[PDB]
Ligand binder design. Sequence first.
Ligand SMILES: O=C(Nc1ccc(Cl)cc1)c1cccc(S(=O)(=O)Nc2ccccc2C(=O)O)c1
Ligand SMILES: O=C(Nc1ccc(Cl)cc1)c1cccc(S(=O)(=O)Nc2ccccc2C(=O)O)c1
Lengths: 497, 497, 497, 497
Amino acid sequence: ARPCIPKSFGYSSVVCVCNATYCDSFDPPTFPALGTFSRYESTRSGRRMELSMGPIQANHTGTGLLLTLQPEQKFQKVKGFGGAMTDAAALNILALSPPAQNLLLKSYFSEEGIGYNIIRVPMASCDFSIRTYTYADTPDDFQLHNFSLPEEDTKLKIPLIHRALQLAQRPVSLLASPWTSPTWLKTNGAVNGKGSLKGQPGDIYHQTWARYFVKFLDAYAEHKLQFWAVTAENEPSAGLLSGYPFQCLGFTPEHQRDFIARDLGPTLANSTHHNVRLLMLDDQRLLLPHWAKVVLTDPEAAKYVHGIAVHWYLDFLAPAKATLGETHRLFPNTMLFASEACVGSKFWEQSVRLGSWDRGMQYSHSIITNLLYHVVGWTDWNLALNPEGGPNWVRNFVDSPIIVDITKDTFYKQPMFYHLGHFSKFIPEGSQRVGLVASQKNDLDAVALMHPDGSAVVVVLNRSSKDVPLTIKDPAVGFLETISPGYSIHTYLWHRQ
Amino acid sequence: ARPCIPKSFGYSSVVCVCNATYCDSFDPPTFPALGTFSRYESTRSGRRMELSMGPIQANHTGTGLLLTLQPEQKFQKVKGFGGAMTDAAALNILALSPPAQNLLLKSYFSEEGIGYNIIRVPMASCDFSIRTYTYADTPDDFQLHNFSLPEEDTKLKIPLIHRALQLAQRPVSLLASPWTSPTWLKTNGAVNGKGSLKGQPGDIYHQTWARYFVKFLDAYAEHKLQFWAVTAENEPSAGLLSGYPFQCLGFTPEHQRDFIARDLGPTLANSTHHNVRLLMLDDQRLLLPHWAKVVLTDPEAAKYVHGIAVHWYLDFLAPAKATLGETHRLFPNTMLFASEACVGSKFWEQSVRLGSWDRGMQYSHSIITNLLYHVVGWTDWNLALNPEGGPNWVRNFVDSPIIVDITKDTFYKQPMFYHLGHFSKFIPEGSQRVGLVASQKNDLDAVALMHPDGSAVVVVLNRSSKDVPLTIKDPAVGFLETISPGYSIHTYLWHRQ
Amino acid sequence: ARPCIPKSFGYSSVVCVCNATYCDSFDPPTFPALGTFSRYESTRSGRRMELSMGPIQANHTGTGLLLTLQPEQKFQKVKGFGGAMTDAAALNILALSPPAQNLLLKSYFSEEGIGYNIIRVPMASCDFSIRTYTYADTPDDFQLHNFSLPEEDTKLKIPLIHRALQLAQRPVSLLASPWTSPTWLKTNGAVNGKGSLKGQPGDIYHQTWARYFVKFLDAYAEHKLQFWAVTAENEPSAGLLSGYPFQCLGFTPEHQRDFIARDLGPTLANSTHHNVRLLMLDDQRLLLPHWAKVVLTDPEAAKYVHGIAVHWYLDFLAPAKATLGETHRLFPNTMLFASEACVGSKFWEQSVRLGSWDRGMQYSHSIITNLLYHVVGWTDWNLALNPEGGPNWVRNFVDSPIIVDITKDTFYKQPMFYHLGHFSKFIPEGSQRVGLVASQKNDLDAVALMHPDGSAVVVVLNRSSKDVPLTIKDPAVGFLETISPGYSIHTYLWHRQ
Amino acid sequence: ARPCIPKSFGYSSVVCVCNATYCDSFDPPTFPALGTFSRYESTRSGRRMELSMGPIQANHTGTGLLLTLQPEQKFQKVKGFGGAMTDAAALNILALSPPAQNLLLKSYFSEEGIGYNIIRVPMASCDFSIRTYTYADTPDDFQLHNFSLPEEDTKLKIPLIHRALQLAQRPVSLLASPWTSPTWLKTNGAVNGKGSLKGQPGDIYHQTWARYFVKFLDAYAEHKLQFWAVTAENEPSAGLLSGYPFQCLGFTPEHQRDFIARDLGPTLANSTHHNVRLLMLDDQRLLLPHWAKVVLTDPEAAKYVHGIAVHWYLDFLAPAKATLGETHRLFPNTMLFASEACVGSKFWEQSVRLGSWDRGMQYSHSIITNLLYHVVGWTDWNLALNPEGGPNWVRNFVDSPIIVDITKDTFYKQPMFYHLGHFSKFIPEGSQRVGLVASQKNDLDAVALMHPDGSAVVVVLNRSSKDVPLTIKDPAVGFLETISPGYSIHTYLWHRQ
Ligand SMILES: O=C(Nc1ccc(Cl)cc1)c1cccc(S(=O)(=O)Nc2ccccc2C(=O)O)c1
Ligand SMILES: O=C(Nc1ccc(Cl)cc1)c1cccc(S(=O)(=O)Nc2ccccc2C(=O)O)c1
């Protein structure tokens, strides 16, 4: 319906500029007829999820690259795609004028946008907050008499979550994660630094902390929000590290095992929220498979654990086969889920690089590699940040797919936004990854899935500068002949019956 | 009553530690006979408003600096001293347990504390808020039917103000200032940035903004709070600067002149709040005397303007005689009032330096300089902040005289608090500044005033590291022999008959 | 000869992109014939020192703005324009390929560029260095036996200075300034922080420090470089400030007075370098006129002081009339010279803003205001920086007129470069400022000067968004009719005989 | 000989203070009889390589962990230990007075110190340089007629290396690595950034770059220095990354394979320096085993490659078995060597933490892990840095075992220095790692080796805070009863007959 308004900030590609009265958008979903395929294309040159349609051919000759669907090779089913409603994201969004707020929310959660169906919600403060607080800061309030949601929840996060759900056609799942407990539950008496829960699993400190989870879910349910899942702790390894700068709460794998078995599992199970799923780890994949082995080899913990949540940040230190792959082999019935991802990275680079094509490619490359190693969902980090990558009370600025410019009542949709959308818009919940085999060595990343209705979706990212002629074979329909431009990302869709 | 509990955090002096059950405090005042003086002393070495007495004698033993009272030289009368009940200050105070809250409020407002009699109240959000909002964010509501106070006012600010007034030694005057209007009244449609009211004075946008002042005063009057004064805009010059990040609303001096003459003046005068005073500028003294000349040489604006409000960034240097002095010389019948002061952080220092004696001296030096240049009152910025100088949704740059540590139910009284108190506790409303003659060049800052009852008060700040032998002469009583220790601050009081 | 290659980085205007094989450049100077005028125009829209010529008219009618030359009102003569060859600047320049280095140096120092004729040279390290060092770091080497120039001088600064002088058609003057002494000469034993020379003027510490100046000049003269001037210390007030973060050496005005009278003056005068000029202050103008009064009222110091050097950084705190104007009135025969200027400023803004028109306007506005208040020369700060504003060992990053992109063998000429050039290219040494009177209130900054040969030059900066029709009257030639576009800067030249 | 002079800077342990006249040192080694062991102990509490002796007894009194020597299990032989003579290290050493310089050099290279026998020498500039340069910056000199060594080599590095060799206990091996080629040989024409050699292996650019290695070895041989080895490129992968800020030269594994096979191998083999070894990779272990597979499965490249050089960023985590282990398994006849290690700063810590015990333990843990995965030598990065971690022309991120304070003619020996020394002093070239069996799970890191003369050496690092009772068994001698204090590091040595 409305095209990208491009703006260069001097980097490799353009952002799409939105404001109170204008934002690029899609037309309502259309579907290609049998014998035809749909193609969505984004390019560093500036194309943004442009739609085209081609014929499926009966024959193919040539020595060119062929990607053959293996529809009977069936793997994981997808839970969904989304991002995090941090204090920083909600503050930035609500600082825009109301019409601009609605265009930003529709960009993410509408079928006119990219169809997010997951929102991750911090349990009280994290580094992407402007102040440190928990829900129960009265010292030694073991009964949690003074547990309460502050305005960050009641005036920022919760109203935006309601509005996202109203705009979404797809059912949206909420995921919650805590960063720190109240300081009076901690060995170090501080929100950050090295420190764990006082005492030992089963004791008053651990029972109070497990009840804090239930109190959080109770409070959100009073605001008519229900959670699909919670994680046991954001980045439990961080609170094992001297001087760790952000809110944290350290657990060894054994401490997490015993906390889940004795306290969190049973307390959640005996609550009205017993159907909320519990995810373990919520940390860098290099902690796998060991963390999964420690927790899940104890049946009194394993019975409460639905899944394993991973973060992308340190992916470069550990191969995905040795971490995700081996974890799946050991525990095939325990889903893997990517609970946090982000790019404000290289030290010679700014936290926010408006128009960076490379950071978009980093997202799509990680999503494809995750899908090939059994991951069922992805939540990005901050849904929106300001041009500095904030606010953040420790100045740990990073990038975000949408950058808000409050002084101009403007927001910018980054290449990351469209790279994410090439998956989130076209891979609904229940889609199952299937096999896809290449005829020759190539510089492409590709993944195939089948929708619940049987239709096919393939995403292709060209990591190279070179255009790559390519054919996709579906023995059900025929041959899809196409070209992957260098530094492009394509999503292909076609019916099989 | 109760002495300071000192604690050092590695800076040049100590803070005084208060909690739910303990805070340093004063006994009720006690007036010694003619021939005796009272001294209150605070020192970098750790003395905190410690009381002593001594004689005023007929013979002069000193041979050093003489300061002679000249009570027949009469200058301005004092309106008072206080600070700002920002969202941040209120949030921090209310994070303490109720007994701790009351000790903090008594510290500022009680005769057990330092006797503040001014509170400055932001009209809706500013940078020391946890979110952006105005009282009328629903757009295109020019009659302001949907004007309303949010929880920041009805739950945080107004109850705290009521409690301060209940505790107050003296009648407290309230002062209101707006940061931004609803953004649908602004040229840039944003809460911050370079932007003014749309249109021109007299038109629907300016009439609506003047009505917004009346709606605000109406709302607070429904909660049984009456204002002594309002400023025309906080920092009007800031909204003329591209990219200005805090909530703002830009006015040139000519725009403010015409807004006052056509819209704000008449509208307030035609309301039940016609007795509320209106102060102009509310900005850095650098803008004087020009801003005063522009506004006050127009009789249709001048008739509505009671005074000129000035801000102080206490870290910088500027020219008081050239700004405050020359403004008084040109407009001697228009009071000068300091509506905001704070000690920023030089870029190499933290926002909050617990125990900084230097930041305390910057306060007392500023107050003395102001009193010597005809200023009638002095209002601090945030009454309380957390240890990071927040919450602030944009950036933490300033300190506060009271720092709250929520996680320990404690608050710290900084040297700034006592340097303020050496004036606020001992200079009631209606006190008059009078002459004080130094007999020779010296390193002290000093000012003399007369209480309404005719008794004397002299404040002496020693900027230098050296003890200074000092004599103070009252022609009516005799000679007060004393010593001003290096870095110290003293308040002397004595009956004159 | 070669036009600007424009590139936007998303700010208000464009940079001009240069590399090893291309840089925008001028044709050799041309001169308009009597009855005609030359106009150079730069605009936010992207014009860069574009040349045009018009007729001088005999008559003029209208109520429009008229600027009338007052050629017999004669003021100061100009020394020149340039910038600082810091370690950071030289490192950045020499990291480019050799052909690119030459295009960058010609941009500044050639008649194909903007004709710089001053270079300021730090005496050893400052904040725009990658390491702290002095020329004499052996402790207690009062004889300066181990005084030596490091590679920063011999391999970076000195070779670039030689090459700039070779490219310059105009004679270039060098100005030197120290930041710190060796630490063993200082009360605090550190390169930064609060600290002055040990002892008292006339003693061994002060004699050694004065001899260090002579040793520096000796060493540079062995490399065939001679200095026009030295300053007594960069920013002497900075070393009076607790925690000052960069290299510094504190002097009160009295200490500087006595150091010059007893040590620096006589030591320089008795050296082979006795013709080098000595400038005092080299600090913010707010220290004037007091600093000038203290130093120059002592005839034993005044006899050695040629001039007063000022920095722009804190100009906003003190009016130029009260500082520069009053200093000129008191000491009319002691030249005023702007020894440092820079813009990496507002806290909500990046250190480097590629293409910022506003920062260019800030330069031209300051140069005009300086010229109107008797200043004879201007040296910008760093001649070139990287895109972060560095390197700088304390991360005190700021902007620069040329930004080097080493990875791309590219450099960017900022709007500041062209705003500077509108003065430096067209105001040779010996030009005398003359009177220029406006017919009506206007939003223009303008300054007129006469070249040694009698020709006229006028620079006009339009601070407003609005085009301003304008006439300039020279009773010698006639009327120059023109328009100043909004946000433009023009230089006009015409012969008078 | 002389003990440590401890000084604390607020971190977890002390540094040892050395100056012109004092540095801690060792007596000449002394070998006790069969049945006696020597222990050298360093502790967080402040012991520094303190020597004690005790008995190896026939009876075992301990009941805790047993470590049993298995001398018939023989693994790799050790080449040695050392560090890098960067421009920065040389500048820092030469800033000391000559007597202090000699104590620093003896600390590293003397039997009075820790017996280093490897020095890594950059071929021209890197980030730890004060300027950019290569040996052939004059462009288009393909025969390299203008190749020459600058003062960094002839004045700083080469004289220091000669002095180190004069002092050295043992024959010292020199190892050379280039960061960038002359930029006129590079695709991007810049010293850093994403860029490789122009053209393809075998052509004039690659032939010239291989000749550059021979010219470098020629030049150093003229100064009577011979190299044991050279690496093909420092960090070849870094030059494949857009924006990489340090000097670099990018090679894919295939490009390195073909460069070695066609140009560098043959050229070195045809020179008088044919005996110099060539090491491949010189990069992070993450690139293994892939990089090794690509290069070493090509026989025309493999015949020139003596070993694989690896880097360690000691702050991160990675997988040694998956990289070093698997590379040894696949290429068991190709030695592994650690060519660079350093402890970066987590973003919340300073580059240099004077006295950090943790950074010391990171060194000894890395060395033990390497020795257990077949690595034959371990080379630190900068031998010395200043207190800010410089000089570095790009950024300061890493610590160094010796920190020089020029302004006090002193240098500080960090815990890193002694943790290194527990290996370097006691493991001469030709020592062989042998088996050591732990009797039960434990928290110690330990490794055993045999000197060429057959005596034993065992290093034991206690990562935990708890004292660990320990027994060490030599089947040939008996039982050594000891205790490993929490955090400590011990080296044990004993004769076996
Ligand atoms: O030395 C004086 N001041 C002073 C100096 C140093 C320090 Cl530490 C403290 C005080 C002083 C000097 C002359 C007259 C008076 S005065 O008492 O007659 N006051 C005045 C008289 C005429 C105009 C203005 C005033 C006014 O007080 O502003 C006071
Ligand atoms: O417990 C052992 N190690 C150890 C554990 C903990 C600590 Cl703290 C220190 C040492 C060990 C176990 C089995 C065999 C051997 S071995 O001595 O026979 N060595 C080997 C035998 C076969 C293959 C490889 C090796 C090799 O040493 O790498 C050593």
